[PDB]
Enzyme design. Structure first.
Site, PDB file in Angstrom:
ATOM      1  N   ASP A 290       0.821  -1.207   0.000  1.00 26.01           N
ATOM      2  CA  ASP A 290       0.000   0.000   0.000  1.00 26.01           C
ATOM      3  C   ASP A 290       0.856   1.258   0.000  1.00 26.01           C
ATOM      4  O   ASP A 290       0.526   2.244  -0.673  1.00 26.01           O
ATOM      5  CB  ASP A 290      -0.964  -0.010   1.187  1.00 26.01           C
ATOM      6  CG  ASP A 290      -2.055  -1.057   1.030  1.00 26.01           C
ATOM      7  OD1 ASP A 290      -2.407  -1.382  -0.121  1.00 26.01           O
ATOM      8  OD2 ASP A 290      -2.546  -1.575   2.052  1.00 26.01           O
ATOM      9  N   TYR A 374     -10.044  -1.483   1.706  1.00 27.79           N
ATOM     10  CA  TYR A 374      -9.481  -1.290   3.026  1.00 27.79           C
ATOM     11  C   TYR A 374      -9.347   0.172   3.420  1.00 27.79           C
ATOM     12  O   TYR A 374      -9.074   1.075   2.632  1.00 27.79           O
ATOM     13  CB  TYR A 374      -8.086  -1.926   3.193  1.00 27.79           C
ATOM     14  CG  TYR A 374      -8.276  -3.348   3.588  1.00 27.79           C
ATOM     15  CD1 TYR A 374      -7.489  -4.414   3.122  1.00 27.79           C
ATOM     16  CD2 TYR A 374      -9.321  -3.617   4.459  1.00 27.79           C
ATOM     17  CE1 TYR A 374      -7.746  -5.738   3.541  1.00 27.79           C
ATOM     18  CE2 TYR A 374      -9.602  -4.912   4.896  1.00 27.79           C
ATOM     19  CZ  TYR A 374      -8.794  -5.982   4.430  1.00 27.79           C
ATOM     20  OH  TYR A 374      -9.032  -7.282   4.833  1.00 27.79           O
TER      21      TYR A 374
HETATM   22 CU   LIG Z   1      -7.468  -7.968   7.016  1.00 26.12          CU
END
Ligand SMILES: [Cu+2]
Ligand SMILES: [Cu+2]
Ligand code: NA
Ligand code: NA
Lengths: 620, 620
Positions: A290, A374
């Site tokens: 990320d 996320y």
């Molecule tokens: Cu997770």
């Protein structure tokens, strides 16, 4: 003005102009990364020189460039063409996300795969995912993204509830070709919706929660000067922001009497990787970096008062560059506030008759980012007693798959036919240490058990041992929770009043490190994640544990190559890199939106002060 | 009405009257422990029969008694004479502590030892400490305390700054005899004061802290009925208080739709041991069983609004017995309040355009106890998402010694000449589980690493394994942080909507357990502390991991004796006993009063619910 001030819109506009006039920012060019460079080592660094590092992508297919610009003097300092097959591709561009879904929508193989499943192509969302490096020789030197499909039944539907398993495509986003469409078989698309704002699913909202009001009638106890310099309860620091790393803390120091004492020169989360543990070929390539591949700072949320940040909040609004060099403000992207933290110290003494209670508090610096499904919160805490703590909060929607009939050893079932593959979330904290100055060393401290016998006749004694890490080759360390292992960063040339070196102790959570096979591609590319602690000698170009260009890099970059120099780290300018992470076997309670789970680390003073540093806290 | 209500002053007065009428509480008798018994198994059972257990000491040396009385019926149910040389002495009485210093002040050996050190006996405080079981045969069957000396320069002085090392005495507190005075040599008494309210040490107090105001304009969100029954955000429980264990939680349940689902029948800290790791004969016997020997509830503080407990606080004021059977109220001894706890869940979805944020909160139930130099806070937390957490907060003044001239492997230096011996603080949580009812089992869950090869060709897969603990002999378990080991308590007869057994997962902190040699007296008396997890079959009389009578009791009782019954625990009424603790190598910053350090554990739902249980939380 401080050399550690946040980049301004004007600075970014000047970078754009400088690049434009130099011929480096034409219509085919895109800025994939832009950030301010920290000052070089120099306790007498005088003249202001604000320099920016830029990664320039070329959409026509020409070689990308790394450029360093001085906005102070209006000049290009260096410009290097990059051979991406050797040193890695540039970070993924936001505008390349859309390209994957649109390219696939006209590919005959993609359409035939959707037609077999009776899926309307207009309702199929494609998650554009980083590619990694595996067996496909035709990908070397090309910018590849891989796509996995999800069905959106209507525009406000949560597509994550409807994964289309058995199907994956690879796309060259520069030449705009679909290189492979792999269809391993038809799985039912899970039919239940996951719309967590739909009253059919939530039921009636509770009416039982009464308000909690948190106010500071005289304003907060901290001050902000020069845009981003913080003073709070003896602490002093600068709050930076970088599009790759996010919030960066500079110049963390503590005012001990008349002296400002350095503790940490630079603190950041320098990488974070999300490796998936499902061996299906639909997902066995799936690993998000990320920070390194996507840049977590550019996806920072605007944080809402009373919802994301509660209390008397001071906001910072960092400025970043868009793909064409225009400044873009992230309004209210950073929250800063103090909060009560319970009892600090308490004793009721029978013999003296004195009853003593003091309360603790902490300063909070936070931001939140969203990468696809996320959402991650990054929290830095400073406490009255000298403790520094980092906490990551993981939430969002879990990444889903089909749940195979007959079960799975690598996937959790969340709902009928709906699975969630096992994965980890692993962070690397880069702590450029400066305990009372730059001459530091690291010791590993283990508990020592002693056997009953002479000098320990009752069998009660126990002790500890410290081992100095003297060279980089011996400074790759593993946790050992059973022996209480911690690491102490000390300054051998600065003693407390007991004539012992001042220090800080790192307390890890001792969670599992990277689980993948040591021979795997992800273990080579995320080698930092295989060990809990690394110590390097400081060098200004050793910034990330995974190297500068993580996307589609074949492996070994970053920490394994730095460590191989085997430099002296015993009483030197050193950097601590701490790996910590969450291993996530998804549970039914994580669906359809996940309650926060947390992981972190903390540092506590270890003989840094001559006595408790909070004796002067008033009684309240 | 509720059988789980707190004991009232009237009940304690009635117990005193019943015992007097029965001839069991004449003027030579003392109540060393008094507490209400839990109802026997059977939902309904006895309509109302409040029973109390009493330990009766005899100051003339006659044998003590254990007595059970029914306050409802006004009867003695059973009374048994105790053989203390076999089964253990009664807990220490508060009035016995004062005896030690007074007896020593007239002993010729004690006076000559102080004269050799030029110390005035009127300034010497004696810490009266539990004796344990060692090599002194004359102590078998006698109530012994051991004394360590500290100098108090003036009435408000902190005596802990001035340990008198090299000297210890043993006292028979019933016959009022000094049995031994041991003098191993003169050590300098450290001269620096440790007076943390003295301005010469604190310096000028900070003027920089601005107030933080936490208020609830509409009052709290929880309700208290029947004195001690709490309902809060779907949770239901009763808050008990016992003079030995302190706060006890009963009948923890969660309202899931229209069903009240049990989770934990009874939760308590059933023992806590503080072993010291200094092999000096002056201290090598030193081990506090704060719960079993001293009774932590007896020393609970009255908590001050705005100092100890901040916010909209609801207090309970439990009633205990004094040594004569008179009720004594501990005013404001339990604080209850709810706290904001940051972000609960958050997601900003690119595809649906929905941005979603919800905040978390927790319910806090706490009390604080003071035992000599140490002060411990006991905190139970309930969260919106079903998590249950316990946290212990350790503060107070560290126990001190001289610091030997040539250094020490078992003692930290805090100040010139002043040492602090290494020690641990170890707790045992007793969790009488009732996950969806009483048919439960425990599984140990380890992460499983997989080798690259067929079916895992990219070397990315990882998994987990669960092992059911089927009998008590296999249910003594160790932590393994490297493999992410946790324990799941499930109900094999209650399934969620995916047809999986409902469960809760216990997350440990994985701190070191008892460090002493396994052959030592303390390892035998605190055997529970040598392993992280024990599981037993429920039995009414198996209450404490160390047995009923801990004081001066050798091994032979407690968890090792319970486990030998090797009872079936696979889908049965079971009790989980979790050991957790702090290993304390004191630092300079712990002196002269220690900032709080913490340890605990938490339980999280694991497929207990059919989806997230906080979908009905409002925005606000
Ligand atoms: Cu997770
Ligand atoms: Cu301690
Ligand atoms: Na450094
Ligand atoms: Na049970």
């Amino acid at each position: 003005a401080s050399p550690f001030r946040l980049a301004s819109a004007g600075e970014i506009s000047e970078v754009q102009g400088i690049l434009r006039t130099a011929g480096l920012l034409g219509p085919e060019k895109r800025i994939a990364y832009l950030g301010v460079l920290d000052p070089a080592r120099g306790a007498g660094s005088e003249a202001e020189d604000r320099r920016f590092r830029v990664f320039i992508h070329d959409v026509s297919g020409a070689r990308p460039q790394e450029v360093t610009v001085s906005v102070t003097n209006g000049t290009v300092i260096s410009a290097v063409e990059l051979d991406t097959a050797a040193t890695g591709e540039l970070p993924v561009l936001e505008e390349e996300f859309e390209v994957v879904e649109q390219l696939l929508a006209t590919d005959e193989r993609w359409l035939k795969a959707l037609a077999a499943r009776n899926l309307d192509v207009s309702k199929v969302r494609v998650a554009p995912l980083s590619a990694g490096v595996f067996e496909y020789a035709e990908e070397r030197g090309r910018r590849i993204l891989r796509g996995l499909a999800f069905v959106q039944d209507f525009p406000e539907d949560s597509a994550w509830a409807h994964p289309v398993d058995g199907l994956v495509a690879y796309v060259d986003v520069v030449s705009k070709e679909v290189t492979r469409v792999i269809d391993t078989g038809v799985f039912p698309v899970p039919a239940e919706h996951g719309n967590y704002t739909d009253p059919e699913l939530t039921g009636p909202l509770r009416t039982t929660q009464k308000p909690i009001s948190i106010t500071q009638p005289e304003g907060p106890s901290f001050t902000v000067t020069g845009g981003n310099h913080i003073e709070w309860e003896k602490w002093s620091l600068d709050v930076g922001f970088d599009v790759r790393e996010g919030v960066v803390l500079h110049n963390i120091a503590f005012r001990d009497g008349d002296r400002l004492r350095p503790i940490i020169n630079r603190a950041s989360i320098a990488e974070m990787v999300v490796p998936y543990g499902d061996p299906s070929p639909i997902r066995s390539w799936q690993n998000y970096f990320d920070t390194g591949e996507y840049l977590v700072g550019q996806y920072a949320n605007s944080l809402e008062l009373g919802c994301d940040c509660l209390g008397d909040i001071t906001y910072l609004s960092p400025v970043i560059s868009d793909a064409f060099g225009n400044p873009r403000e992230i309004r209210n992207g950073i929250c800063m506030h103090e909060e009560d933290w319970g009892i600090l110290a308490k004793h009721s003494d029978l013999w003296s008759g004195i009853n003593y209670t003091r309360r603790n508090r902490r300063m909070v610096i936070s931001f939140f980012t969203t990468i696809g499904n996320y959402d991650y919160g990054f929290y830095w805490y400073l406490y009255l007693d000298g403790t520094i703590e980092f906490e990551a909060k993981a939430t969002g929607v879990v990444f889903t798959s089909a749940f195979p009939e007959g079960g799975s050893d690598n996937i959790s079932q969340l709902a009928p036919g709906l699975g969630a593959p096992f994965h980890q979330h692993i962070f690397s904290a880069r702590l450029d240490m400066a305990i009372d100055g730059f001459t530091n060393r690291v010791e590993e401290e283990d508990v020592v058990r002693q056997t009953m016998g002479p000098g320990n006749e009752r069998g009660n004694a126990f002790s500890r041992k410290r081992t100095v890490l003297t060279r980089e080759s011996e400074a790759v360390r593993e946790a050992d929770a059973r022996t209480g292992r911690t690491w102490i960063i000390s300054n051998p040339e600065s003693k407390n009043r007991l004539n012992e070196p001042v220090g800080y102790k790192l307390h890890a959570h001792n969670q599992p490190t990277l689980l993948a096979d040591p021979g795997s591609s992800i273990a080579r590319r995320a080698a930092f994640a295989t060990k809990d602690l690394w110590v390097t000698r400081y060098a200004d170009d050793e910034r990330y544990p995974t190297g500068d260009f993580v996307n589609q890099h074949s492996g070994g970059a970053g920490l394994p190559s730095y460590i191989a120099q085997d430099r002296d780290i015993d009483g030197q300018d050193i950097v601590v890199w701490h790996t910590f992470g969450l291993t996530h076997f998804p549970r039914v309670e994580d669906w359809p939106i996940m309650p926060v789970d947390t992981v972190g680390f903390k540092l506590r003073p270890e003989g840094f002060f001559d006595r408790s540093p909070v004796l002067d806290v008033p009684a309240n």
